[PDB]
């Protein structure tokens, strides 16, 4: 018989890399979620999901840097982490 792995077709879109802090702004929300929503909104009508998640990686990595009165938490950066067990391309639209 034809089977598929039971772990196939999962996509885990983590906001940060393994072992790291994730950053959240009190007024604007988390870096990752604000970036994810903006990229979905701008591109979900035409880009495949991995590519969209790749624009989110770039936005979080380039447009955000932490500001903190505590030097230990000041000027930090974040990269999100795409974990894909997907087996096909994902488009949030249909023709």
């Amino acid at each position: 018989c034809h089977k598929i792995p039971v772990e196939a077709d999962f996509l885990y879109a983590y906001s940060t890399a393994p072992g790291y802090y994730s950053w959240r702004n009190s007024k604007d929300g988390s870096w990752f979620i604000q970036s994810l929503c903006a990229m979905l909104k701008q591109y979900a009508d035409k880009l495949e999901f991995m590519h969209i998640l790749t624009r989110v990686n770039r936005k979080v990595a380039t447009e955000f840097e932490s500001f903190s009165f505590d030097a230990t938490f000041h000027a930090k950066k974040q990269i999100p982490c795409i974990v894909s067990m997907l087996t096909k391309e994902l488009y949030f639209y249909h023709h």
């Binding site: 077709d9 906001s15 940060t16 790291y20 802090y21 994730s22 007024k27 604007d28 988390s30 979620i33």
Partner: protein, 141 residues
């Protein structure tokens, strides 16, 4: 066959678990800004035609039971599944208001064999949470 079938009658559910307030007994401070995320998410997936369900401040037990119930739904006419988790966490862990639960136990409910009506269908987990206490100092470009 290079692309998932997304023309089922429904796009699918989008469960958003928004945990903002934690028991003292965890030493986790209020997650200010999370409601802006939860609302942004709700509107974003609504536009993508997902059946959004927002839940707020769930204990670990409630997260597990909620996920069990959802995975026991009949998703036959749904193209996909999305779960967004907004909370404190550690590597491999998401926090309920009263403590940690393994992400593995949450995602296992949707495995290809224990959720038959999502077999073959994309199952997305969006996780806004810490995965430890490392800090990235970045490098100038």
């Amino acid at each position: 066959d290079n692309s998932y079938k997304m023309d089922y009658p429904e796009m699918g559910l989008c469960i958003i678990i928004n945990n903002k307030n934690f028991h003292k007994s965890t030493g986790m401070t209020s997650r200010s800004g999370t409601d802006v995320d939860a609302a942004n998410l709700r509107e974003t997936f609504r536009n993508l035609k997902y059946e959004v369900r927002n839940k707020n401040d769930l204990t670990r037990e409630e997260i597990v039971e909620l996920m069990r119930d959802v995975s026991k739904e009949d998703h036959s006419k749904r193209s996909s599944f999305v779960c967004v988790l907004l909370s404190h966490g550690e590597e491999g862990i998401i926090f309920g208001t009263n403590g940690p639960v393994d992400l593995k136990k949450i995602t296992n409910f949707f495995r290809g064999d224990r959720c038959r009506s999502l077999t073959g269908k994309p199952k997305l987990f969006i996780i806004q949470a810490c995965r430890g206490t490392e800090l990235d100092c970045g490098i100038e470009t």
